[PDB]
Design a protein around this nucleic acid. Structure first.
Length: 526
DNA sequence: GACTTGTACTGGAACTCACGTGAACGAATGTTTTTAG
């Protein structure tokens, strides 16, 4: 499953206008595109990327017939990204001295998508445009653009310097204050809104991001990310009732797919280094014993009991693999989140294409939701997988419904520890002033706000939408080392810290209560 | 002052626990190529 992405970028004079105290839009767009290319390259994704720049002095586009579609250059064709693209983005791409509209650039991007994707099969086609919307443009080709986009199945995404005192990139705050926007910018925003509505309906509004917002949203990869595989099984409620189901891994910790290979310092080759493991007895002679002369064993309280691998396999617990059986139903209040185990969460839907299984699963989910119940079930990936006991609870949304499954603990997996009570201690009991100070601190540091007469909490620091900074740090360090072999690693990028920190308003409001708490609470290190 | 014996103190190593990283095998599924009917 491959994809084609055409990145359209403005390099005009307006993009270079760096307002004091705010980074220029050109730099923010460069950072966003660099992040996208880093993710695409270092992830070893088989995705094709092309780059079109509109606003350059020259013209290097196929549509350069006469005096139309000028100041547009196809910097890179539709071929796999490499370090060359990153190097060009970083150093040898400078702002142009001419201003060009984004409509002819978008037409050029569609033409590139159509022509290049003639000898290759691509499941998805995406076009991303980074522009300021501060250039004159003509609407004569809007209808044909929309028709071509709809016919060719091409997705669209817009990135602008402004979203729909101090300013920080990815700082969970206002990037571009709404004081100074030019009229042409308003017209361009309205046109972009019209195009997005005409393409994806009302859902298209959410696809108009901002550089600062996009730097901490992972939105650029939304339309190219691959779906997880499905695990098919049969949910069993008895011995004669079965519902075909498919389970996906809704949540799973993401690790680094690429490992580190040990190489020799003098020569950077892994074939000159060999790693071997040896076994020796408990004798001064260090007698060597072959692997075939080794037997598995276990400790039995100061006594060693030999236990060969074949014997263990013969006598190990055996069960019928690939089972999803409902042990029973219990009140949801009897299952507590603190007891959740495992490292994954499963989302169970009906089978691929069948109305009967969907109806049965919907009936079960609705019954559980109405009765306030969850299903204690037995889960086993396959014959080898160790069977586990888990809880499946309904999850109903306006657009879809499913069963969320999370593993549950065993009796020996629970640790019984005793902790001294704090509410009945005469030495650690806080005073009224201390409680008031803590209450003031909590009030002054609320990450959720109440909306205007609608009773809908709004999250000010949605950490769930923040990408993992480790991957970005690793990618930036790898790129710096590749392009600068003879320099040390650079410091952590500022926007990473900005996105990893809360809004400055919270700290500003919390300054006073924190000082009050410090004065009231005496803390001294031992 | 030098040796011996007995008692008390104490920081380092052994052990355990827990987590992260990397490598290998087999199960289950899906997909592609080749060959007999």
């Amino acid at each position: 499953n491959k994809a084609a992405v055409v990145l359209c970028m403005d390099v005009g004079f307006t993009m270079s206008n760096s307002i004091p105290g705010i980074e220029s839009p050109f730099e923010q767009a460069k950072k966003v595109i660099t992040m996208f290319v880093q993710r695409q390259v270092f992830a070893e994704n088989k995705d094709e990327i092309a780059l079109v720049l509109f606003g350059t002095d020259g013209t290097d586009n196929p549509l350069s017939g006469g005096d139309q579609y000028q100041n547009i250059t196809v910097h890179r064709h539709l071929m796999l990204p490499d370090f060359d693209l990153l190097e060009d983005i970083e150093s040898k791409i400078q702002p142009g001295s001419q201003q060009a509209d984004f409509l002819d650039a978008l037409i050029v991007s569609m033409d590139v998508i159509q022509h290049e994707t003639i000898g290759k099969k691509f499941e998805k086609r995406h076009i991303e445009i980074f522009t300021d919307l501060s250039s004159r443009f003509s609407k004569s080709q809007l209808d044909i653009i929309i028709h071509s986009l709809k016919k060719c199945d091409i997705s669209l995404q817009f990135f602008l310097p402004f979203s729909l005192g101090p300013f920080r990139l990815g700082g969970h705050g206002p990037s571009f204050p709404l004081k100074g926007i030019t009229e042409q910018q308003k017209e361009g925003l309205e046109i972009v809104k019209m195009v997005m509505i005409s393409l994806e309906g009302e859902d298209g509004l959410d696809e108009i991001y901002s550089f600062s917002e996009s730097l901490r949203k992972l939105c650029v990869f939304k339309k190219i990310e691959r779906h997880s595989i499905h695990w098919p099984c049969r949910l069993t409620i008895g011995s004669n009732l079965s519902i075909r189901i498919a389970a996906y891994k809704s949540i799973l910790q993401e690790r680094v797919k690429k490992t580190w290979t040990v190489v020799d310092a003098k020569t950077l080759k892994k074939e000159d280094i060999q790693k071997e493991t040896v076994y020796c007895l408990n004798d001064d002679d260090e007698t060597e014993v072959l692997k075939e002369d080794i037997i598995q064993g276990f400790r039995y309280g100061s006594d060693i009991v030999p236990f060969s691998k074949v014997d263990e396999e013969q006598m190990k617990y055996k069960s019928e693999g690939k089972c999803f059986s409902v042990l029973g139903f219990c009140k949801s209040s009897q299952v507590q989140r603190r007891f959740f185990m495992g490292n994954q969460v499963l989302k169970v839907f009906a089978a691929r294409d069948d109305e009967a299984a969907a109806v049965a699963l919907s009936s079960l989910i609705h019954a559980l939701d109405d009765l306030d119940m969850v299903a204690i079930v037995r889960y086993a990936y396959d014959k080898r997988a160790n069977p586990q006991v888990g809880v499946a609870f309904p999850h109903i949304k306006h657009n879809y419904e499913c069963l969320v499954y999370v593993q549950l603990p065993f009796m020996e997996d629970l640790r019984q520890y005793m902790f001294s009570s704090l509410k009945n201690s005469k030495k650690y009991a806080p005073t009224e002033a201390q409680l008031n100070a803590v209450d003031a601190l909590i009030d002054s540091m609320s990450l959720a706000k109440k909306d205007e007469k609608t009773d809908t909490l709004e999250d000010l620091f949605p950490t769930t939408k923040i990408p993992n900074p480790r991957f970005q740090r690793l990618f930036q360090c790898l790129l710096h080392r590749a392009l600068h072999p003879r320099e040390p690693l650079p410091p952590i990028q500022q926007h990473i810290w900005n996105m990893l920190n809360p809004p400055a308003e919270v700290t500003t409001k919390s300054q006073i209560p924190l000082s009050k708490i410090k004065t009231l609470f005496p803390l001294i290190e031992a």
